[PDB]
Design a protein around this ligand. Sequence first.
Ligand SMILES: Nc1nc2c(ncn2[C@@H]2O[C@H](COP(=O)(O)OP(=O)(O)O)[C@@H](O)[C@H]2O)c(=O)[nH]1
Ligand SMILES: Nc1nc2c(ncn2[C@@H]2O[C@H](COP(=O)(O)OP(=O)(O)O)[C@@H](O)[C@H]2O)c(=O)[nH]1
Lengths: 297, 295, 179, 191
Amino acid sequence: VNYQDLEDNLNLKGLISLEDDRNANFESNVLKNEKFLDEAREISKKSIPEATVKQMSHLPEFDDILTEGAKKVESRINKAITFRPSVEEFSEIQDLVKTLPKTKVIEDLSTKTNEITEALAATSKTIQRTPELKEQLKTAIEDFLQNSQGKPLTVQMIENLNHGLRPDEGEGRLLYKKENLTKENAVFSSPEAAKIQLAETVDFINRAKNEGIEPSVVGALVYQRLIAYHPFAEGNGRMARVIVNKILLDAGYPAFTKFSDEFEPQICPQTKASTKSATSSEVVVEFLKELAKKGSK
Amino acid sequence: KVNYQDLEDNLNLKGLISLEDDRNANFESNVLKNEKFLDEAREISKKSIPEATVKQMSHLPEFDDILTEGAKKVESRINKAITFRPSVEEFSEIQDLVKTLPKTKVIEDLSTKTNEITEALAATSKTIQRTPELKEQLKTAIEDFLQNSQGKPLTVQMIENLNHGLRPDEGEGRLLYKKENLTKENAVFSSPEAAKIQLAETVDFINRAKNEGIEPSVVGALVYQRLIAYHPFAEGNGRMARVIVNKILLDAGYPAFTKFSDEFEPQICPQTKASTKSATSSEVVVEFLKELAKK
Amino acid sequence: MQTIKCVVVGDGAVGKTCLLISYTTNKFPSEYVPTVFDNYAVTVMIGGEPYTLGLFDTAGQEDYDRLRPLSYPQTDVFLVCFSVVSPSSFENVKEKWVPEITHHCPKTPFLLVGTQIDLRDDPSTIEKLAKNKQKPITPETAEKLARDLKAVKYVECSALTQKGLKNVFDEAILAALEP
Amino acid sequence: MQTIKCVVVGDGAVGKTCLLISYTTNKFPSEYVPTVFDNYAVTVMIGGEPYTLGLFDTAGQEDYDRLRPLSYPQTDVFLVCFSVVSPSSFENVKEKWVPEITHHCPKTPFLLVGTQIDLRDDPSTIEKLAKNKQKPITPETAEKLARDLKAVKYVECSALTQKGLKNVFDEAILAALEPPEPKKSRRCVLL
Ligand SMILES: Nc1nc2c(ncn2[C@@H]2O[C@H](COP(=O)(O)OP(=O)(O)O)[C@@H](O)[C@H]2O)c(=O)[nH]1
Ligand SMILES: Nc1nc2c(ncn2[C@@H]2O[C@H](COP(=O)(O)OP(=O)(O)O)[C@@H](O)[C@H]2O)c(=O)[nH]1
């Protein structure tokens, strides 16, 4: 638990202190949050016959039954994303950041817009084959970079960004997801827990910048948890890559595209127990390695 | 607008009006443009629309405004009813009306405040009177609420506990907040999400009003009206509002409030039958102080 | 197999939600009712064959005029409701509701459903109407209005006492099955 | 009219939600399914007469072990699912699922349903199983476990290709018409 004796030129200690504070308040901010609990209660009751609901309502344990599964899932996710490295992983992250290419001059807003657009294009064959879609996403990226320039990030900025990154949807679509979704075999936060921890991630991004915490490590953690939270109905991948690439490009690092195909399913905790899931620190290491791999190309 | 710069004010009503002007001016951003609020309207509206019609309508840009127009018009109607913006005549009348209220110099202790709020609830309902066990359970919630809120800023969590404490006959597993828009004798209430949003605004309003020294009897009147109009919780909204308001009153030395007259209560909220004249925010305050002056 | 979609329209506060809850639960709701009753499906056996009956509540308030007709597609029968002790809601049957469903669903049958029968003889209700020089809507007056607006028939019910409530949905199924 | 409540259980990621969506919508869900399929009712025709078939999805994950049985009351037939390319999910049929439904619904019929047939011929799936010295579950292997665990029969389907998908629920309806008996919440009081 103690890192007082380890070399630190990335403010990882200050980063770990932010995660410890957020983690210490996770139970109250999420597990004891009544909007979260009410969501779990309603969803759970939809599968229970009304005769059984009337019967169970006389047992004091009934509320814990309705909410236990939801709380365990969020706790599982929070355990996967909370950054608390070992002494070995701490020094390893120190060496890995030194291997990243970092440009002295930071690109202007127009240039950042193009590079973040191209980073999304490399991930999707549809963006490449569809010039109209790429131009639409380019505008959303430009709008997000204009509104967030020299200003603290806000959830409204992310809502607008996510909506901008979904131009092929059709009118009237819900912004946020309306139910718990599963990706392949992975678990995501409940809609309400995702909204709660989306705002905490925003606070996490601002504090890390104010505290001078290594942006590449910040980008890694932000990528993992946004994907794990999955707040929005669609476009969570695009949105995460745009936010992370802003954090990186603001620091002069190359834009991020995607993890290896073998490593992506390890980011989230899974429903198939045989799949080994990666810890938050392991995600950071593989992120920095992937970022340094783009300095070779 | 209307000018108050020349009016006598020993209640900090000017500060109260300025608080309401800021909240009202940000109502559109805080509620109507809030995506959690719009998403709720979108999902509820689509539940009644056939899937074939949704696919057709998703090609029309106006579709999203159709899903949320009705919900936005209801909240605007509610906010218009609760926003405190009195005329110069109502301003001066409220000033005189507060001077007529009985105010005890010595403020009661925690145990005494608990009992008086308990009795204030007892007079409103015949059920609590005939059932001593129910009355004892509500007395514990009020005591717990007064202990956790003494000398500390009010929080939504304190109210959530209070509301839950005032619902002891429900059974386990019940949702705390309401799950849908409800209507009571043709009245309109805030959507579940908009009621949560504006419940928090009312909490910030209560704390800010106490710091700014705004007349507590006027604060309690406004708080009673909007809590009832918002109706955030599945049950116990009436009991909960009376407890919070009576705390605001008893903290200032005023007698506890019970209920408006039977003729005036349905005028607090906007109605579904348009022929029913609804009372303005200032008219609710005026009637509130008049009922308080009688006690 | 075959489903029957029945949409309940009419002015706000005429009892649409209550008559749906009272018909589906056989218990008049005493607590605060929902704005719009959650759409409900029952497989009714009245007659010789089973049919899935879909009951759909609407928001009669003027604020929902744009959204409400989006629920009308695939409707088999409408229940244009007015409160027999509310002359304005009766007048809005001719002024708004029948023109609305006729505009969106021209060849869809509808029933004129007078609600809240129990109040027709309530002295306090009659006295209140008489102050405004109004009087409850008699069945003869509504029957005439139903024939003028080409309604299938005029039926009336009280969600509170369930009098004629079961018959209102019986006739709606008959109107949908035999246009 | 009689209704038929069919509850789908089994380990996580065996394809319960997908086989329900592919059966009720005739389209395999592309990209992201709900954790639990929204319970759905369809009118199926059996014997010339209509039956309301109620399809209920469950969360197989361990985190929902206390909540899941509360959906079991008035169930007419269970679909104990396992992935034919997941030996652990097959093992959990004997180790977890059949004991669970038997505890709560002793006299309620259930089918052993092998899911994801298409992956049994997938070379990448065969390769991944071989890494752990594992191999797919043959129909003969699952049919023996069905008799051992007193299952009605073993049926097989692929939600992706819909192969045998319609047949799985046909057998589920036939098993449901074998008269069952009510269910119990076990009543495990705490503290
Ligand atoms: N006496 C009486 N009151 C009724 C009847 N139906 C509804 N109400 C009352 O009328 C008010 C509005 O009912 P509601 O269902 O919300 O009307 P809606 O807006 O059209 O859905 C409620 O206070 C009900 O209690 C009835 O048959 N008899
Ligand atoms: N190839 C193939 N994949 C399937 C089939 N059914 C489900 N899947 C996949 O299995 C994964 C988990 O399926 P899911 O429906 O969530 O299973 P559940 O957790 O038991 O509900 C998803 O990635 C699906 O794409 C199938 O029949 N064939």
